[PDB]
């Protein structure tokens, strides 16, 4: 996936050249960023369940009409799919934090997202609200540099939803 190391290697390769000093400094920056990013991944993995259930409840609070019958969020199966989707998003955010790139989000979430949302009439505002709750909670589960990394990736997902 498109991560710092992979971009480095692929850009150098498509230009038929070795890895220069700039590319190695990018790699060094990635290796330094690994510590806060992996600690943030640890924090979001540890608290995944409360995070996702709170995010689903936040979605239902901002979008009360959804739970009523005849629309998307009525019924146990639909809400279970909701929790599964937000779990997917959180999982891929943690993958991005580990890889230090938007690669996993781009490959697994961002690509083809709008077409799927139109095909199944899934409103992106739902997922944006869930990610906003995740953002608010990771503001209280992390601190310092890890907080900034997690926020970076969550905002990346939000910006690509809107």
């Amino acid at each position: 996936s498109r991560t710092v190391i992979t971009e480095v290697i692929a850009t150098a390769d498509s230009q038929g050249r070795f890895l220069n000093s700039t590319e190695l400094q990018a790699a060094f920056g990635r290796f330094e960023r690994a510590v806060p990013a992996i600690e943030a991944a640890r924090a979001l993995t540890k608290n995944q369940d409360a995070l996702v259930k709170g995010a689903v409840q936040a979605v239902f609070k901002k979008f009360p009409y959804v739970t009523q019958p005849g629309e998307k969020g009525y019924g146990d199966s639909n809400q279970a799919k909701c929790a599964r989707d937000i779990g997917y998003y959180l999982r891929f955010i943690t993958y991005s934090l580990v890889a230090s790139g938007t690669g996993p989000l781009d490959d697994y979430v961002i690509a083809g997202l709008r077409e799927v949302n139109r095909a199944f009439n899934l409103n992106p505002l739902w997922y944006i609200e869930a990610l906003n709750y995740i953002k608010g909670e990771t503001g209280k589960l992390l601190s310092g540099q890890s907080k900034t990394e997690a926020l970076l990736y969550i905002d990346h997902a939000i910006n690509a939803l809107s």
Binding site: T6, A10, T11, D13, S14, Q15, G16
Partner: protein, 225 residues
């Protein structure tokens, strides 16, 4: 198909943009064949650097050069030449036998350069590459004008990242799609040998049912109840 970026060159650019564009151009247009320094076209890229020609004009020049002709024309059938030119200049494989008839007749009547211009002046080339981005293999992703055979035939024409379209094969420069385009068959999807170890544990044919060792019969009421 996914990892190498589409290389685009505009009127003003720095040194590294220019050099990388040239590397990508030579690695696509000349197949993946080694072009020696004595073979490198200097005036054409000076005109490209000035802005006299676009990247499209540079492709036109290169496809008219003795490097391109010596590799993909002079020791080939016309079928092989048309396959190569579709792959390297249009990023796809020929879809119909009518395309081969058209291009063979065009070369026979109007010459080689009219053939190259039919490739580069085509609306398909300009739709996908315009004047500034280097041609790339483009039937590995679905596009508004693709056909069922296109993916398979491009896969047949593409020999891997470490493979190339070279006349220096001991068997020569031979057409591989000449029999399949005529019969409207798909291309071959046999990939190289270094890819056998890749993702061995996938089970795409999961729904397929294993047969029983012996078909069950019903002797008394008939043999299919």
């Amino acid at each position: 198909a996914t990892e190498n970026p589409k290389v685009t060159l505009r009127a003003p650019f720095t040194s590294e943009e220019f050099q990388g564009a040239l590397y990508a151009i030579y690695r696509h247009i000349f197949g993946n064949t080694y072009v020696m320094e004595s073979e490198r076209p200097t005036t054409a890229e000076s005109q490209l650097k000035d802005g006299r020609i676009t990247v499209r004009g540079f492709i036109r020049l290169l496809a008219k050069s003795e490097v391109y002709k010596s590799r993909f024309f002079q020791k080939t059938s016309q079928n092989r030449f048309i396959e190569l030119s579709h792959k390297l200049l249009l990023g796809r494989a020929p879809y119909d036998q009518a395309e081969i008839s058209y291009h063979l007749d065009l070369w026979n009547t109007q010459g080689y350069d009219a053939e190259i211009d039919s490739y580069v002046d085509s609306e398909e080339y300009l739709d996908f590459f315009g004047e500034d981005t280097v041609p790339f293999l483009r039937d590995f992703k679905y596009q508004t004008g693709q056909q069922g055979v296109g993916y398979s035939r491009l896969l047949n024409l593409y020999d891997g990242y470490a493979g190339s379209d070279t006349d220096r094969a001991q068997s020569g420069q031979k057409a591989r799609l000449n029999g399949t385009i005529a019969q409207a068959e798909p291309g071959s999807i046999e990939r190289p040998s270094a890819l056998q170890d890749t993702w061995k544990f996938a089970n795409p044919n999961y729904r397929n049912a294993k047969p029983p060792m012996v078909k069950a019969l019903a002797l008394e009421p008939v043999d299919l109840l």
